[PDB]
Design a protein around this ligand. Structure first.
Ligand SMILES: Cc1ncc(C[n+]2csc(CCOP(=O)(O)O)c2C)c(N)n1
Ligand SMILES: Cc1ncc(C[n+]2csc(CCOP(=O)(O)O)c2C)c(N)n1
Ligand SMILES: Cc1ncc(C[n+]2csc(CCOP(=O)(O)O)c2C)c(N)n1
Ligand SMILES: [Mg+2]
Ligand SMILES: [Mg+2]
Ligand SMILES: [Mg+2]
Ligand SMILES: [Mg+2]
Ligand SMILES: [Mg+2]
Lengths: 504, 501, 502
């Protein structure tokens, strides 16, 4: 007999009877996963046949108790009481929670499927020893649930905090696999940094596995690690303004490394973007072809730059983003959208679920929108975004603001960061997408993501003043800008450049 | 809040959500059936979201309680406790009964689906306030469940051998107005002490375009008490059949020229039509489905069934029903029966299609039908006669006739008069019996007619065996004797002696 | 290197690559069949072919058995194969002989006598052996037909040409095939048996083969649980008396499969002889019926019953070694009837065949010496007791004590026992009579005597009836009566009919 506080939600295995590979049993899989992790187990399915259910539940309760792990049942509350189960899970469309509590009485864990903040409010108006934990929405798409992102999970953890539901644990569920578990753990944190997921739920990743022991050992590895080094550049927090000597080193490195920068964009920017890249002494590639994507990313110092409202299918954007994250190379997200039209908002939010971005760059509107929300406002927004997507965020305007929300790539269960939206580093400065892409692209393993982005914003802003002076209108401004970028970097003398870098 | 003994199983409505006609609601149907009968109601939901289930259950509990009728739930015991239901029904493959009792505690009705005696034994090894009632097997075939009366009797018999006095019974599966009275009529304990406490329907009310009317009809049938299944008298006669009665029978059939439809082999086709001709009535050898209703509509029509025939079960079913609809007599003369695995199968299936006026077999045919010397044969003959609520004939040295119709009486739970004490007397035959019964007027008597037939046949037999030179001439002298014997009604003359058994 | 005369055609395994069960190889199957019996013939890409052929030639040579190839003559020469098989639509035989040169065995698929003629006007060291037609139906690509071919091999004196039977051969019909596939002159039979699916497609090829071996090198086919001994002494009164007693005491169950005219009249004859008739034409019942003591099958023709069920019934009785009597209402009366009847004669072994002058001459594939010759031909052809009804009834015994052998083969058409039964100038009635006499016999009985007993009894009842009757009508019933009276007093010394030798 376990109690609320003895429950370890770390790796939470939810079974599904009609998904087991031939020559393997449900007992067999659940056994393998207990010997290698999963501090919790839930039985469903049916095939019901309510009597065969009960026999399988008892058979499996012995196994779990043997390994000192609780057994949860869904959604048959009666079978739960009948076999002396340790808890029950119910969905939004199952028996109302109060009714359940009345039958099972205190002591028993009650799990609830929750996908929206609105449902966290209800959960809260009910107080403790009603809902004990919740499975957060369906994180990613999946074939396991017969009918039916991290941004969405955050909105829920945030409601658990605004309502101070201290008594309610959380696990994330739906489409969780080794290719996205660290990213999920990493960016699913309360905005105030005080709360994260207490564990991870899998079904197909273990159950449907030809080797369930191995699959589980892998998920365990990911969950009890603490670093997500998502790009082969330094992520150290830097609080000292970026020195002239550092900017100089950045530019040298990218000039010497000749980074390959893959542009995925519409057209207007195709040509102008390739010019900026050429000026910065690196080679542009405008491939939007799925098969090439893994080969491109394999080339030394490769970099991805994303634009939006593009002619490329979501299936390939997903493919590209993943391709770069697999080789730990940097992605820069520069929405041409974003939230400009209903259709763009949709596509952009879908993009932000495909992987981890090294940098997100927007203007005042693009940024406020991303922050889900003047001058003090733009700063708050910039940090919110940076923290939300665990990335370096740039907000362009008269002043350009840069915030570093990577937190050295740190994640943990429940904790969650050690660091809220409010107190991450954010500095100020008084085509940019490709500039930033080239600076980050050139950095070696010992580099620093944040300094590089700042370097880029400085460089760009510097070239701007020069061009606006030497030009005769919009036309020549464009070409004088490219020229300034070229001249500026062929002589590393940042001590010279106009733009002033302050703290925010 | 109801208790075990307040439950009225009379007309028990079991719902099914995805079977309701367009423009009609489950509330709507269940309402109509409460206003006209349904004395009990069960709700299912194997396919929905457990929350919509609970909302519909409460919505419908108010309706039932409003009409002072309990609400039963299946098989979600949890939903049952949660909404304060009055009982739960579970199947053979659902949660074990002891476990259920432990959660819901005494006071709540527990129903169990039961199809075999073996399961009645288990029900009994558990004693009272475990299983309160049972739904007996699937009586007839149906499209309602996703995966006969003889069979129900075997279950009622086990409820008696085990003295499970505490357990009610309802019959279920394929019950409609075309077979409800026959079900109530023949589903009785062998000792006559127990019958079905009620009848269960799903499609007959739920899937109805006019649920109010459909229900009013089922009610009519359930609380009636007579099943006059043939337009002949069914009165119990304890006085031996007098010569004057036999004489009247023969006269009637000669004057009525009954049309006797033979469904038979090919050996019996010809020989059977001869006997029919001799008795002054016309044979027809139609095995065609479309003709069957027209044939039966002809005055004094009669059906004679043989087995191991080339005719499809679908048409036998069609014929048997055709005659029962017009309340005309069927005689069942198995050429099988239980002679081969295939025959046993077909015959038992036949006995589920309708009500027979008479069943005729030899020592083996009969013992088999009784599901079991010279005393043994007598016990067997009554068993059969009572089982199929019919007049049963067992041919041999002595021919035994038993009358198990019990004046066509049925009731709920009661149910009666046991196997042991129905009337039984002692003394080609299929066709003879068919013609005697065929000729009887509304005021006649089924039992006397059958006896008359057996007498007549046995009489013609002695005469023929004497006037013949072997098997060949015996056959034709028998037909002749049948002809001569009936053209002069003088039963005072005939050889065969009629005693009590 | 083998030569013509070292070739043992006993159990001849023909492979088929795409028919092997999972987890089993062609090497695996052919190995199992060599260790338990087995000559061998092999039938994708021409290069994989050659590799498999060599691989398998080593195996065969290891067990001292030749390897034959079909129909790639080139692959044959290339791998030094021991012989080649070709079909009727493959390379002409002379051409083949020219390329492979003498010494190599040449097999030819043959299904008609016409093709035996061609095989013959080519003389020796052209065609060495032949696979006879397709005996029974099969998904891989009758005995009366095989006989016509063995007969042509004899009329042409093709002494140099062996024969194997092929197509649909399995344990349920191998002995019957060996048993009735013999030259009309009795001098020639099949030199062996060919299987594909029975061994190749088997989950246990070792066992399957051991079984086929058992059957082939046995020599008795006891196809009915009655004596088959050749009796040359006329059937004595005391024997007829014993027969009738036995059937009266045994009350045989006689299953009639017949028209509708004969249904009733046939059941009466059966009843009179103190046995029970059953008129079932239902497939599922058939195995249960035959399992009942002293059960007997009587077949009529142009019936409403499907060939699929007749096959089912005939087999059902042969499996329990009970007697079948074949009394064609056809036969050869119409094109459709001939067809169905011949198909029936391929379904199993009959204990007796009964026809009239036409029915019989037809069956013999052809007066009074003529009728006698015909009757023996039929009796011998279908290895059965044959009855030919007329003024004289002729009975011939072609069972030859149920003896079979490879190549040998037996005793010709000409010299099996044949007797006659006359009484003076006077149908489906005799069929039922015969069915009841045979039905009653115990293991120690004798098939031949019983049939004769039946014919005598019937003929006897006939004279009596023709005298006591007033026309066709009463004749029928007086006949049943006479059958009844005659058997209730076993006094054959009394009966009119005279039994002579033919
Ligand atoms: C703890 C908890 N939270 C939520 C639910 C509902 N739920 C969300 S998606 C899905 C399966 C995805 O598996 P996968 O994609 O790993 O194959 C299910 C069963 C539940 N039953 N338990
Ligand atoms: C009291 C009780 N006994 C048995 C069962 C199981 N059951 C067997 S047959 C049938 C469908 C017949 O519909 P129809 O009358 O339209 O043929 C169902 C529901 C149950 N659920 N409740
Ligand atoms: C020696 C010889 N004779 C004939 C043929 C032609 N042939 C007639 S039937 C048959 C397949 C029978 O398989 P199963 O016994 O499984 O029915 C084949 C292959 C030949 N290729 N070789
Ligand atoms: Mg169930
Ligand atoms: Mg933009
Ligand atoms: Mg549900
Ligand atoms: Mg009978
Ligand atoms: Mg004939």
């Amino acid at each position: 007999k376990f109690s609320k506080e003895q429950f370890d939600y770390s790796l939470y295995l939810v079974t599904d009877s009609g998904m087991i590979p031939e020559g393997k049993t449900l007992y067999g899989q659940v056994e393998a996963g207990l010997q290698n992790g999963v501090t919790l187990v839930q039985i469903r399915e049916k095939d019901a046949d309510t009597k065969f259910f009960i026999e399988e539940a008892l058979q499996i309760k012995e196994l779990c108790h043997a390994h000192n792990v609780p057994l949860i049942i869904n959604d048959r509350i009666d079978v739960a009481m009948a076999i002396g189960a340790d808890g029950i899970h119910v969905g939004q469309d199952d028996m109302p929670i109060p009714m359940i509590r009345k039958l099972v009485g205190p002591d028993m864990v009650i799990g609830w499927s929750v996908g929206f903040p609105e449902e966290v409010d209800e959960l809260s108006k009910m107080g403790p020893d009603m809902v004990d934990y919740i499975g957060v929405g369906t994180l990613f798409p999946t074939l396991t649930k017969k009918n039916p992102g991290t941004a969405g999970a955050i909105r829920v953890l945030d409601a658990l905090e605004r309502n101070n539901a201290h008594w309610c644990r959380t696990v994330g569920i739906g489409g969780l696999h080794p290719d996205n578990i660290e990213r999920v753990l990493y960016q699913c944190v309360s905005s105030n940094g005080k709360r994260s997921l207490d564990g991870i739920c899998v079904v197909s990743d273990i159950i449907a596995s030809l080797d369930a022991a191995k699959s589980t050992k892998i998920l365990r590895g990911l969950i009890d690690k603490t670093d997500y080094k998502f790009v082969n550049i330094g992520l150290s927090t830097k609080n000292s303004l970026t020195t002239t000597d550092e900017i100089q080193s950045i530019i040298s490195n990218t000039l010497k490394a000749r980074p390959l920068v893959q542009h995925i964009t519409n057209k207007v920017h195709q040509n102008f973007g390739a010019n900026v890249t050429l000026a910065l002494g690196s080679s542009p590639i405008m491939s939007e072809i799925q098969s090439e994507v893994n080969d491109l990313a394999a080339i030394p110092h490769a970099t991805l730059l994303l634009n939006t409202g593009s002619v490329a299918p979501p299936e390939m954007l997903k493919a590209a983003i993943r391709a770069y994250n697999d080789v730990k190379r940097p992605i820069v997200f520069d929405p041409v959208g974003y939230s400009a039209t209903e259709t763009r908002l949709l596509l952009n939010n879908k993009l932000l679920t495909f992987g981890q971005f090294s940098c997100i760059k927007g203007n005042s509107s693009e940024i406020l929108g991303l922050a889900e929300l003047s001058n003090e406002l733009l700063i708050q927004a910039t940090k919110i975004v940076a923290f939300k997507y665990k990335t370096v965020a740039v907000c362009t305007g008269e002043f350009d603001f840069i915030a570093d929300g990577t937190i050295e790539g740190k994640y943990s269960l429940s904790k969650g960061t050690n660091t809220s939206v409010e107190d991450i580093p954010c500095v100020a400065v008084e085509s940019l997408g490709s500039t930033i892409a080239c600076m980050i692209g050139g950095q070696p393993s010992e580099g620093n993501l944040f300094h590089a982005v700042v370097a880029g914003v400085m460089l760009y802003k510097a070239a701007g003043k020069i061009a606006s002076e030497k030009c005769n209108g919009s036309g020549s401004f464009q070409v004088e800008l490219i020229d300034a970028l070229y001249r500026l970097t062929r002589e590393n003398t940042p001590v010279t450049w106009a733009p002033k870098l302050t703290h925010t």
